[PDB]
């Protein structure tokens, strides 16, 4: 299955780079402040899924935003 | 206060889903990962992923894919 | 019912009480860098899926993938 | 190490115990069943807010919540 496996790999590079290269994302991450972060996550997740929609693209975005939020506080 | 962030993530997430989700559904489909050899495909994908560098977005994308691949097997794990 | 969260916190706290300290030191004796963190991850996963693959081990591995990445970023560089 | 190593064996076998413990917790399994896929997300967010109501935070809670969340997903993905 190595045919599709390296196509799966190249898609994950492209998705990973688009998130790290998304300036709207990067600016939004900075706009938040580590005075109270986990709350930020629970309110942002609820506003995001308020329209009831659910998919893998929203999960990855939310996970990237959340984890970058964690890295910031860690450094 | 913090509303424009949630709906900007949903906007960003939907764009990702619109142009990759169809791609991923078939590749995993062609791959036919079994309840058995799924970790082998995962190991080869991760190695091919971290060859050109390791940024947080690739880490996030890999962990997410690990979870989706696991969800795929438990559904289509017949073979 | 609203105690589900309270009971999850209790269950989660029992896990953290007896594994977290153990995990913090093992990771430190691993001395993972950004270069060899994934190799260690692949070896850990292989021996983990050696005795079978259940959802809890899948969840524990995905959770460990993220904690190891956070460890590398913080204590990397052969700390 | 570099590809092998002692500690990899200690961490893996430690990951065995936590995973098997989660699948072997009958109160956790009953809590999954007690939920209803009438509104799935809302169940998760009310549980997450109840879980972190005491203001405490740790990795054990992360794994518990992640296991609960995913099992909740599996149920919905194969049950209605
Ligand atoms: C803290 C550990 C981080 C692990 C990363 C895992 C990502 C967390 O997401 C868990 C929530 O699950 C989202 C389920 O999404 C279902 C999407 O619906 C599509 C239906 O088809 C499923 C195809 O796999």
UniProtKB/Swiss-Prot annotation, chain B:
Motif BH1, chain ranges: 48-67
Tissue: Expressed in a wide variety of tissues, with highest levels in the heart and skeletal muscle.
Motif BH3, residue range(s) on this chain: 5-19
Compartments in which it is found: Mitochondrion outer membrane
Domain text: Intact BH3 motif is required by BIK, BID, BAK, BAD and BAX for their pro-apoptotic activity and for their interaction with anti-apoptotic members of the Bcl-2 family.
Function of the protein: Plays a role in the mitochondrial apoptotic process. Upon arrival of cell death signals, promotes mitochondrial outer membrane (MOM) permeabilization by oligomerizing to form pores within the MOM. This releases apoptogenic factors into the cytosol, including cytochrome c, promoting the activation of caspase 9 which in turn processes and activates the effector caspases.
Family per record: Belongs to the Bcl-2 family.
Subunit comment: Homodimer. Formation of the homodimer is zinc-dependent. Forms heterodimers with BCL2 and BCL2L1 isoform Bcl-X(L). Forms heterooligomers with BAX. Interacts with BCL2A1. Interacts with RTL10/BOP. Interacts with VDAC1. Interacts with GIMAP3/IAN4 and GIMAP5/IAN5.
Designated name of the protein: Bcl-2 homologous antagonist/killer
Organism: Homo sapiens
Swiss-Prot record, chain D:
Keywords noted in UniProt: Acetylation, Apoptosis, Cytoplasm, Host-virus interaction, Isopeptide bond, Membrane, Mitochondrion, Mitochondrion outer membrane, Nucleus, Transmembrane, Transmembrane helix, Tumor suppressor, Ubl conjugation
Motif BH1 boundaries: 50-70
Impact reported for residue 26 to D/E: Strongly reduced interaction with MCL1, BCL2, BCL2L1 and BCL2L2. No effect on cytochrome c release and subsequent apoptosis triggered by etoposide
GO terms assigned for molecular function: BH3 domain binding; channel activity; Hsp70 protein binding; identical protein binding; lipid binding; protein heterodimerization activity; protein homodimerization activity
Post-translational modifications: Ubiquitinated in the absence of XRCC6/Ku70. Ubiquitination promotes protein degradation.
Substitution effect: residue 80 to R: Partial loss of polyubiquitination
Residue ranges of the motif BH3: 11-25
Family note: Belongs to the Bcl-2 family.
Function: Plays a role in the mitochondrial apoptotic process. Under normal conditions, BAX is largely cytosolic via constant retrotranslocation from mitochondria to the cytosol mediated by BCL2L1/Bcl-xL, which avoids accumulation of toxic BAX levels at the mitochondrial outer membrane (MOM). Under stress conditions, undergoes a conformation change that causes translocation to the mitochondrion membrane, leading to the release of cytochrome c that then triggers apoptosis. Promotes activation of CASP3, and thereby apoptosis.
Protein name as annotated: Apoptosis regulator BAX
Organism encoding this protein: Homo sapiens
Residue numbers of the full-length protein present here: 53 to 128 of 192
């Amino acid at each position: 299955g190595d045919a599709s496996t390296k196509k799966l790999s190249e898609s994950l590079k492209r998705i990973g780079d688009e998130l790290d290269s998304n300036m709207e994302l990067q600016r939004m991450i900075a706009a938040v402040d580590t005075d109270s972060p986990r709350e930020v996550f629970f309110r942002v997740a609820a506003d995001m899924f308020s329209d009831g929609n659910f998919n893998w693209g929203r999960v990855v975005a939310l996970f990237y935003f959340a984890s970058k939020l964690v890295l910031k506080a860690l450094s | 206060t913090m509303g424009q962030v949630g709906r900007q993530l949903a906007i960003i997430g939907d764009d990702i889903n619109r142009r990759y989700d169809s791609e991923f559904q078939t590749m995993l489909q062609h791959l036919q990962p079994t309840a058995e050899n799924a970790y082998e495909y995962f190991t080869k994908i991760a190695t091919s992923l971290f060859e050109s560098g390791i940024n947080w977005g690739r880490v996030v994308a890999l962990l997410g894919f690990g979870y989706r691949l696991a969800l795929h097997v438990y559904q289509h794990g017949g073979s």
